[PDB]
């Protein structure tokens, strides 16, 4: 194990590992800043849409208390779906989403107005979830290098370096003995 070829190679792995640690740490920081912008937008969006949705819901429940027979009929008969396009925010794959009675009538226009903001919430909230996961995956790679890989390289280099010197002294000690023979 402790040869000079191993020493030079492990010293090279340390330099690379040190640089990789710095690059990954910078990446995590860059992802964090972009996340900060997105997560604030996520917060504001959610707070607003939560108030609007519940209000639209409370207006519909006040309309219900006609009969459950008629309300069931109206809620039977356009089909809306969504397209999901992928885009990259730095290194992260992220979705882009777009859509494809009297008192009980006004409430319908209430839910219909929610939809654009409800889809926007889905898009932004998912984006932040995906950004957060990338931050954590970057963090694990940083911690692997910082707390495992680099210290193991440092300690092994120090050890081999010491062992090489010990053997060199034992070798000259033998030569001095052989000399006197």
């Amino acid at each position: 194990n402790p040869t000079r070829m191993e020493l030079t190679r492990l010293k090279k792995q340390l330099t690379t590992a040190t640089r990789g640690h710095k690059l990954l740490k910078d990446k995590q920081d860059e992802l964090m800043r972009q996340f900060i912008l997105l997560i604030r937008k996520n917060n504001e969006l959610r707070q607003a849409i939560e108030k609007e949705t519940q209000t639209a819901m409370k207006d519909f429940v006040l309309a219900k208390s006609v009969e459950e027979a008629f309300i069931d009929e109206l809620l039977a008969l356009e089909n809306v779906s969504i397209s999901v396009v992928e885009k990259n925010i730095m290194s992260v794959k992220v979705p882009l989403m777009n859509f494809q009675n009297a008192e009980l009538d006004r409430s319908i226009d209430g839910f219909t107005q929610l939809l654009p903001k409800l889809l926007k919430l889905a898009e932004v909230e998912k984006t932040c979830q995906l950004m957060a996961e990338e931050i954590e995956k970057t963090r694990r790679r940083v911690n692997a290098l910082e707390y495992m890989t680099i210290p193991q390289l440092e300690e092994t280099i120090y050890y081999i370096k010491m062992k090489l010197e010990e053997n060199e002294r034992a070798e000259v000690t033998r030569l001095i003995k052989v000399k006197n023979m």
Binding site: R46, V61, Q129
Partner: protein, 102 residues
């Protein structure tokens, strides 16, 4: 093209059926978990769910968090929220940034 699903109590999420959303009305941890799993299996793009139903299946929702689709979006009922959606946002800030940035 992806479908949209909704999970919550009848009185709250019924009008979503007007737009052709898969509106389900689960009330127990078992049935709500089944619906989300099948919806995910059927390649739904977004799944909206009331916080009262989401409060019963936190481990199911957490499984799809790092997935592109479906996006499991917590919404209120006509009673309100449990503050879970805003707590999840708040929590992600704490572990990504390290301090309250909101």
């Amino acid at each position: 093209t992806y479908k949209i699903g909704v999970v919550g109590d009848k009185d709250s999420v019924s009008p979503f059926r007007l737009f052709g959303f898969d509106v389900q009305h689960g009330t127990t941890k078992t049935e709500i978990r089944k619906t989300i799993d099948e919806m995910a299996k059927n390649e739904y793009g977004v799944i909206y769910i009331t916080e009262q139903c989401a409060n019963l299946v936190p481990e199911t929702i957490e499984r799809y968090k790092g997935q592109l689709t479906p996006a499991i979006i917590l919404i209120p009922s006509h009673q309100g929220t449990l503050g879970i959606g805003l707590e999840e946002i708040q929590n992600s800030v704490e572990k990504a940034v390290g301090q309250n940035i909101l």
